[PDB]
């Protein structure tokens, strides 16, 4: 029975803003298994980070999103 | 290095109770004068290159 954070508090959010810039391949399942968060927050986090531009998209598709580090 | 490359120069026929194996004659690539008979699983052509893990056993169950 996996437990995943469904609400984002400060520690999880700062862990996002630090660990995620390091990941070379970034996606929903990557955030979900390497940061213990639900798919809904994972999708929101990917959409959040893309607007600032610290991850960039290679392929935007429903049911599979492809992001890498910004450069 | 236990990898031997051998080229099928002749297809002999089908073997196995259910016909699934094929008798072939292959010649070695390192020396093109040493030919051996092997049992092969899948579909084979002349000039197909096989990978022999061991390279001394003669094929049994002929026809």
């Amino acid at each position: 029975r996996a437990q995943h954070a469904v609400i984002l508090d400060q520690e999880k959010y700062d862990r996002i803003l630090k660990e995620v810039p390091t990941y070379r391949y970034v996606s929903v399942s990557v955030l979900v298994d390497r940061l213990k968060i639900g798919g809904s927050l994972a999708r929101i986090a990917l959409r959040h980070l893309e607007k600032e531009g610290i991850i960039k998209p290679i392929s935007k598709h429903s049911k599979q999103a492809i992001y890498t580090r910004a450069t | 290095t236990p990898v031997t490359l051998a080229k099928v120069i002749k297809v002999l026929g089908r073997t196995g109770s259910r016909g699934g194996v094929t008798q072939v004659r292959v010649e070695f690539l390192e020396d093109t004068s040493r030919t051996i008979v092997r049992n092969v699983k899948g579909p084979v052509r002349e000039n197909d290159i096989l990978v022999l893990m061991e390279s001394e056993r003669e094929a049994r169950r002929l026809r």
Partner: protein, 145 residues
């Protein structure tokens, strides 16, 4: 994106209509834990209580939770269609009711006992425990019916 950083006011599993409503499931599908409210009823109650649909039950405040409870308990005066309800034109007072958490089993028992007391065929079949809606019983329903 609804990126939220909300302070330590989150509430886990909570009690509405003496029922255990989880606080991690989205409000609409979390309300469906209560007997008598399904996905349609929960969607309509939440959307007529004007809560954000993209919210977990845990960050709904108590006053909007009680608005939800009032809407659920007395739906007919909140502009609900009424054809959307659980117990319309009942056999006793002819009122359009929606049976809820602990009342579902008691009103079911009432219908059962009414049929068995009047010794209608459906009530007799219920008394035997067999299928009542006319299904064949030769092959299916063996392990428990």
């Amino acid at each position: 994106s609804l990126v939220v950083q909300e302070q330590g006011s989150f509430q886990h599993i909570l009690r509405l209509l003496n029922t255990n409503v989880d606080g991690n499931i989205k409000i609409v599908y979390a309300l469906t834990t209560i007997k008598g409210v399904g996905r349609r009823y929960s969607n309509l109650v939440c959307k007529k209580a004007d809560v954000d649909l993209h919210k977990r039950a845990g960050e709904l405040t108590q006053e909007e939770l009680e608005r939800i409870v009032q809407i659920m308990q007395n739906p007919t005066h909140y502009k609900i269609p009424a054809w959307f309800l659980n117990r319309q034109n009942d056999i006793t007072d002819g009122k359009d009711y929606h049976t809820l958490a602990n009342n579902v089993e008691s009103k079911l028992r009432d219908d059962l006992e009414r049929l068995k007391k009047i010794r209608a065929h459906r009530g007799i079949r219920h008394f035997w425990g067999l299928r009542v809606r006319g299904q064949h019983t030769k092959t299916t329903g063996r392990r428990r019916a």
